[PDB]
Every structure is written in C-alpha cells, then in structure tokens.
C-alpha cells in the first residue's frame, strides 16, 4: 500500500479507539477550534456590543460573570449577517469588541456537528449496522441550526442568535416569546409534547424493563450483575412486562413487540423535536404563534379577556423592556 | 466582585467530600481479591 492508501485505511479504520472517518476529518479540527475559542472567550473575552449600540455586554468570567450569567456574546447588530472572521477586523481588540468569537464558534460548531452526524452514519456503515441513528441525531442538530443560524438569517443578524450561555439562553427565550408568542405556536407545543413525552416514555420503559428483570443475583449484590455484557439471552421478561402494562391500561395499548416499542421510543421525541426546530425555524420568518388577542367580544363590543390576553400582557412587558436602548421607531419589525 | 466569602469553601467541600467518599470506595474495591 502507498501512503494515501494507508492513510485512507487508518482514517476509516474500525479499530481506532475513537472512529475518525472522513466526516471526522472535518469534524475534529472544527470542533477543536470551536471548543478552544469558546473556552478561552468564556473565561477571558471582554464585553461585547451585541446590539450594535455601543453598549457592550460582558460575557466572560474574568469580567464579572459566574457560570450561570456567563456567555459568549453574539456578534454586533451592526455586523448583521456579514461574515466577520478574525481577518476582517483591524485588530483582535476590535474583533472582540464586535463579538467575533461568537461567529467563529457557532460556525465551527455547526460544521462540526453536521460532521458528527455524518460520522454516525459512517461508523454505522463500517460496523454493518442499520444507518439511522444519525437521523435521530438530526433532531437536536436541526434545533441548534434553528437557534444559531436560521433565526439570525430570518431576522437579518447574528446578534439574534442564541447566546452561548445559560442566562443568555433565557434572554433568547424571553425575547422570542415576546416577538413570536412561541408558547402559542403548535410546533413548539409539539416540541413540548416531544420532550415531556420523551421523558415519560424513557422513565416508563426504564421502569418496566427494570421491573421485569430475571432473578440472577442475591439481595446482597446489585441486580446489574445479573446481566453479563454480550450475553445472547434477553435479561428481562418482556412477556411479563407487557402483561403488567397491558393490565395497567388495557391489553392493546401495550407493546408486545420490542422492535415496535423501540421504534416508538425513537420516533416520538425525534419527531416532536423536529417540530420544535421547525417552529423556531419558521418563526424565524415571523409566522408566529396563534393570536387570539381580543378574540372574545361581548354584545356591545366590550373586550372580554381570555388567558391568551393575559399572555399578551406579559408578552407586552417583554416587548417594551427588551433592548431598552436599541429602538428609535415604534415597531419592532425584525 | 462582592461574592459570598464562604462560596469558595462551600464549593470546595461540596466537590471534595463526596468525591473522596467515592475514591475511597473504588480504591478499596480494586484492592479486593480477584
């Protein structure tokens, strides 16, 4: 084998402790760059003029943040969707003031995670597996794309990307509620059904399988030792599990087919989260939650408030208070 | 910053005490007969 042939054999090698692969060839440097930039910025980045109004927001630990408050702050509203790599700045000081780390990090991250997904396919192919784990991973990934790329595109600025921080995340959420009434959007409700439901079925499945483990141990040892890695025989009794759950609700509401069950387990959270992601990604173009403001009117024409209108009042508080120095004109049009 | 001056010891003992408990248990597990 020549050098290229050997290299190809190593890259795609199934014997590497961590699979590399061709997707990995892109993934590794981008994720390393993104990670290093993120960590360094999170500790040491100076405040960033996120909203382009020469009002810099401090995101880093050394500039007065803790873990909950800390963030890598989104690039300046003055930049918008302009590509702002380090080399477009006259200096690192300028790059930092205008939030360059945000763009570097999110672009490398999105590239790297796309490659992570491809890499999941690739390894599944190398191991003779079915290929669709990566499709499940498409659910969280799309969501990241929604908040780091699609929303900024729709609104015309990366300053509207989700900040890389916990409280910044909350800021993004509150402002999103103010501007799109996301709670009242059916795609977000499907998202919620997705994660609540995902958790429910995770706990449920966990509990039923745990409930029907076959006795292989004594009381003075963990039941986990009752299973040996790679054993051929199933470690629990699915017939008993189904017997239980089928009586808990009713027979035909219970899975007796493990494959159908696990497919359901995969599909519910993945599809739901796909809808969450599409929710963010379509509210990115301002097709917003249901608006029932003043939907209920009495015979004279008096407005009769519903819970939607109270939501509306909260939303109003959010709208009027956010970015208190950024608006000169009465409507927030993007 | 005007942080709580006990936050350091609180965090340090919060990490160290159970971590140490776990290390004790692991290490005494390893040294048992194979």
């Amino acid at each position: 084998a020549n050098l290229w042939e050997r290299f190809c054999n190593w890259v795609t090698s199934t014997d590497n402790r961590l699979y590399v692969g061709w997707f990995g060839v892109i993934m590794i440097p981008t994720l390393l760059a993104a990670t290093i930039c993120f960590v360094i910025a999170f500790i040491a980045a100076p405040p960033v003029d996120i909203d382009g109004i020469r009002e810099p927001v401090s995101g880093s630990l050394l500039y007065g943040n803790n873990i909950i408050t800390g963030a890598v702050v989104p690039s300046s509203n003055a930049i918008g969707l302009h590509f702002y790599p380090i080399w477009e700045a006259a200096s690192l000081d300028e790059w930092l003031y205008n939030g360059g780390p945000y763009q570097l990090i999110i672009f490398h991250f999105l590239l790297g995670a796309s490659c992570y997904m491809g890499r999941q396919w690739e390894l599944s192919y190398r191991l003779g597996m079915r290929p669709w784990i990566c499709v499940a991973y498409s659910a969280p990934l799309a969501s990241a794309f929604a908040v780091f790329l699609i929303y900024p595109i729709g609104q015309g600025s990366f300053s509207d990307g989700m900040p890389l921080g916990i409280s910044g995340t909350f800021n993004f959420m509150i402002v999103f509620q103010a501007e799109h009434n996301i709670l009242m959007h059916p795609f977000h409700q499907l998202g919620v059904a997705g994660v609540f439901g995902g958790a429910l079925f995770c706990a449920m499945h966990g509990s039923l399988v745990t409930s029907s483990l076959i006795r292989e141990t004594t009381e003075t040892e963990s039941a986990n030792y009752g299973y040996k890695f790679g054993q051929e025989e199933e470690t629990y009794n699915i017939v008993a599990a189904h017997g239980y759950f089928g009586r808990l609700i009713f027979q035909y509401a219970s899975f007796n087919n493990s494959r159908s069950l696990h497919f359901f387990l995969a599909a519910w959270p993945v599809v739901g989260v796909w809808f969450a992601a599409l929710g963010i990604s379509t509210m990115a173009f301002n097709l917003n939650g249901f608006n029932f403001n003043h939907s209920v009117i009495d015979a004279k024409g008096n407005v009769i408030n519903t819970w939607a209108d109270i939501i509306n009042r909260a939303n109003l508080g959010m709208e009027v208070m956010h970015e208190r120095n950024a608006h000169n004109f009465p409507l927030d049009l993007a | 910053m005007e942080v709580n001056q006990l936050g350091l010891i609180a965090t340090a003992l919060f990490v160290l005490v159970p971590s140490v408990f776990l290390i004790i248990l692991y290490v005494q597990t390893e040294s048992q007969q194979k």
Binding site: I43, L61, L62, I67, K228, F229 | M1, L8, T11
Partner: peptide
Amino acid sequence: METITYVFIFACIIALFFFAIFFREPPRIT
C-alpha cells in the same frame, strides 16, 4: 477566587472525561 473555582471545576470535569473514556473498565464478553 470565584473564577478560579469555576474554571477548576470545569477542568476537573474535562480530565474526568479523559479518564472515563481512555481509562474506563473495559467491557468484556463472558
């Protein structure tokens, strides 16, 4: 001192990632 604490805990977590991956108890088929 807060920052030192936060970064310290983070670094401990990353090191933990390292040991948990490369120095895990190997899975063995019985």
